[PDB]
Write a protein that binds this ligand. Structure first.
Ligand SMILES: [Fe+3]
Ligand SMILES: [Fe+3]
Lengths: 278, 269
């Protein structure tokens, strides 16, 4: 009951489906070559965090991996995803008039292989109780772009959603499990959802298949990003476009409310104060 | 100067350069992907290592890095060079020390020193001494004269009096890209450079090998058994978990009850 219908569809209708249902499925979002390039850049970094041989150390049953600080690690994430026209058109439409500017809070590759337990139904914006307590009347905060780096089946745990749960008057009700619809995704096939939408990841019943995803969680300008990107090497930041630099917090935000800017250095543009080109 | 040699140069020729000069440079000995795997595996444990300090280390690598456990400890070129360096009378060898070295801005220049100085009985024999230390110095980052690339004095390994450490103008800098290696003897005069640059850390991976009869500096018995059992028997011998087979005492050395030690401690034959 999640409408995909997102190839010839305009983004304004994508924003409309996001407003009505709280979740939308974008078909054919990433080219299969883009998925292969992303998986190739991402594999070494993941393999180097998780050594299969371990002398107990932390622990052996590894049903789950995930990784962030993507801009330092992946060029294709650095350029293609952070500058993607559809992500930004949907971001501008979702935040709308009163917000104005936005930046990325969290960019992560998530992997759950065989034996992964099913998740509880929840809302990510529960991490901000002052916003969460307003329930469905609250302002837009989190926007989540979930790219499928592998097939997304009900059998390896396709993520489930409850459409319309972003409008509920009481967010202490996370709904029930018979209200959840699974999101089947094949190649790039992104799914977009709000931080107010009830959802849960599925169980990986398979003995053999690993679910892999790339989550891009965006914030309005006034909400603190989860990730700090200042240890990113300066040459990597200087290779990025100013839009992508603003996404990772190296440029000032421009809310229309406070038109003169936010996240400034001596009331001046920040990245320019620390060596980036104007 | 120092002689670069790789690609079509066979390890027999690198051993010959090592005998004549005491130092040699193997170009692009590690692939950039291998350097990337090494830096990724080493960065988290370098960050957790404990006035800002400019000198930084790590050892007990086999417990810490898979790429060192498998690729580096089993590298064919290093073992060919080891067999050629110790030669017939020795027979067997093992690694004494495996370390990551990090020196960034503010690193003072080092004195010319000859590492085998830690062994007065061998060091007193000067250039007539037996081969003891073999140092494989892999570049995990660029080595520039700007960031303090190590300097060497070619031929200083065969001098008749090791109380003479030479002087600074006899030293040749070893310029390396990431992944390039420099091999040198424990009898060769050398010194690290000063890193004047305010923004750049120089990082290296040194593997110091010994003949079978010289005690390794590193003790690897606290290494968890699961990583040791994941290693090849050659790599296990490199870290002291298997007995050596010197040509001198062919029955074996470093045994448990006159039997092979690794089998004696629960390892597979
Ligand atoms: Fe969630
Ligand atoms: Fe030295």
């Amino acid at each position: 009951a999640i409408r995909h219908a997102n190839k010839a569809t305009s983004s304004d209708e994508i924003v409309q489906i996001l407003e009505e249902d709280g979740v939308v499925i974008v078909e054919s979002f990433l080219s299969s070559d883009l998925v292969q390039k992303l998986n190739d850049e991402l594999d070494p970094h993941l393999a180097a965090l998780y050594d299969p041989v371990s002398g107990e150390s932390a622990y052996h049953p590894v049903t789950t991996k995930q990784m962030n600080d993507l801009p330092a690690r992946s060029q294709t994430f650095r350029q293609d995803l952070l500058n993607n026209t559809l992500i930004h058109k949907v971001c501008e439409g979702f935040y709308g008039p009163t917000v104005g500017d936005y930046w990325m809070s969290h960019g992560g590759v998530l992997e759950r292989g065989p034996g992964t337990p099913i998740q509880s139904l929840h809302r990510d914006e529960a991490v901000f109780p002052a916003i969460h307590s307003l329930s469905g009347s609250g302002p837009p905060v989190m926007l989540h772009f979930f790219i499928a780096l592998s097939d997304f089946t009900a059998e390896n745990g396709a993520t489930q959603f409850i459409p319309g749960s972003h409008k509920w008057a009481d967010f202490n009700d996370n709904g029930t499990r018979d209200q959840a619809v699974t999101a089947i995704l094949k190649a790039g096939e992104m799914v977009i959802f709000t931080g107010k939408t009830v959802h849960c990841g599925g169980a990986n019943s398979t003995k053999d298949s690993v679910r892999r995803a790339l989550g891009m969680n965006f914030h309005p300008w006034y909400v603190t990003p989860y990730e700090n990107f200042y240890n990113t090497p300066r040459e990597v930041v200087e290779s990025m476009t100013p839009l992508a630099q603003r996404m990772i917090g190296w440029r000032t935000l421009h809310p229309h409310s406070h038109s003169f800017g936010w996240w400034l250095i001596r009331n001046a543009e920040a990245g320019q104060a620390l060596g980036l080109k104007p």
